[PDB]
């Protein structure tokens, strides 16, 4: 459920059971094992999922005013069609608090920001809405990564590497705040990952920007 903070406070009786869960060294695998409803094959990554389930640490930078290094957590899943990345994560859309689900060719860069047009309520047009700044700290389950124009995906460099936005149009000009973690389900230009041709080139990306990612399991 949602994130008001005040209307979600739990009782101490539940804290008993929570710290009970914490009292398992089995807990390292329990919740990763409780990720799927019924899926019992090679969950060895679900521990790597769970570091984003328990969605990251808050290393604040109200300390020095400098260098603003959030505990940025960024991981993507990529592979063949066999894996239920779209369906797993269609269900995980029914898990994530800030559950989004878009993908390559669902919405453009401006399909993510500045939904600007006329408003007969004011009897005037207005500067208007976006997608990501509603999903702060959240996730969008995403697939078909190698599908977008270069207009998008040079935005992602900006956010994945600074987690920021500063905008300039003829109407409103903005320096907003936007920041969150990834999930995605990228795909190659191929049908199967080509044997003896790594995703170092199989999926369609550059030379060390491919290397740039934290780790895509």
Ligand X SMILES: Nc1ncnc2c1ncn2[C@@H]1O[C@H](COP(=O)(O)OP(=O)(O)O)[C@@H](O)[C@H]1O
| Residues 178, 135, 4, 27, CA torsion sign | negative
**Is residue 170 involved in binding other proteins (CB under 8 A)?**
yes
Query: What does 87 bind: other proteins, ligand X, none (CB cut-off 5 to 8 Å by kind)?
Result: ligand X
**Is residue 83 involved in binding ligand X (CB under 6 A)?**
yes
Q: How far is the CB of 172 from other proteins (least distance, A)?
A: 9
How many Cβ atoms sit within 10 Å of the Cβ of residue 89? 24
Task: With beta carbons less than 8 A apart as the criterion, state whether 67 and 149 touch.
Answer: no
**86 in a labelled binding site:** yes
Q: How far is the CB of 118 from other proteins (least distance, A)?
A: 17
- List binders of ligand X among 87-146 (CB under 6 A): 87, 143
**Is residue 173 involved in binding other proteins (CB under 8 A)?**
yes
How many Cβ atoms sit within 10 Å of the Cβ of residue 139? 23
C-alpha–C-alpha distance, residues 187 and 143, integer Å = 7
* Interface size with ligand X, residues (CB under 6 A): 10
Burial of 62 from C-beta contacts in 10 A (0-12 / 13-18 / 19+): exposed
User: Binder to other proteins among 64, 168, 209, 215 (CB under 8 A)?
Assistant: 168
Task: With beta carbons less than 8 A apart as the criterion, state whether 214 and 173 touch.
Answer: no
Q: How far is the CB of 173 from other proteins (least distance, A)?
A: 7
Judged by beta carbon, residue 174 or residue 199, the one nearer ligand X is 199
Judged by beta carbon, residue 52 or residue 86, the one nearer ligand X is 86
Which position has the token pair 């990345």?
Answer: 85
Which position has the token pair 């003896």?
Answer: 196
**130 in a labelled binding site:** no
Q: How far is the CB of 125 from other proteins (least distance, A)?
A: 13
**Is residue 50 involved in binding ligand X (CB under 6 A)?**
no
CA distances from 194 to 14, 107, 190, 200 (A): 50, 29, 8, 11
Q: Which stretch binds other proteins (CB under 8 A): 8-16, 118-126, 135-143, 166-174?
A: 166-174
Detail the residues annotated as belonging to a binding site for ATP: 79-86
Footprint of other proteins (CB under 8 A): 168, 170-171, 173
């Amino acid at each position: 459920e949602d994130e008001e903070g005040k209307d979600h406070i739990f009782p101490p009786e539940r804290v008993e059971l929570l710290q009970l869960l914490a009292k398992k060294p089995d807990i390292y695998d329990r919740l990763a094992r409780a990720i799927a409803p019924s899926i019992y094959e090679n969950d060895d990554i679900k521990k790597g999922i769970l570091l984003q389930l328990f969605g990251g640490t808050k290393k604040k930078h109200a300390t020095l005013g400098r260098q603003n290094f959030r505990s940025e957590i960024h991981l993507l899943l990529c592979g063949d069609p066999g894996t239920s990345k779209s369906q797993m994560l269609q269900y995980v859309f029914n898990l994530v608090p800030r559950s989004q689900y878009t993908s390559g060719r669902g919405s453009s860069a401006v399909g993510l920001t500045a939904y600007v047009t006329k408003d007969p309520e004011t009897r005037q047009l207005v500067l208007q809405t976006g997608a990501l700044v509603l999903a702060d700290n959240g996730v969008c389950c995403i697939d078909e990564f190698d599908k977008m124009n270069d207009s998008t995906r040079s935005v992602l460099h900006e956010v994945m590497e600074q987690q920021t936005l500063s905008i300039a149009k003829a109407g409103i000009i903005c320096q907003l705040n936007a920041r969150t973690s990834i999930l995605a389900a990228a795909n190659p230009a191929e049908s199967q990952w080509n044997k003896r041709k790594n995703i170092i080139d199989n999926v369609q990306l550059p030379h060390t920007l491919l290397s740039r990612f934290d780790l895509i399991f």
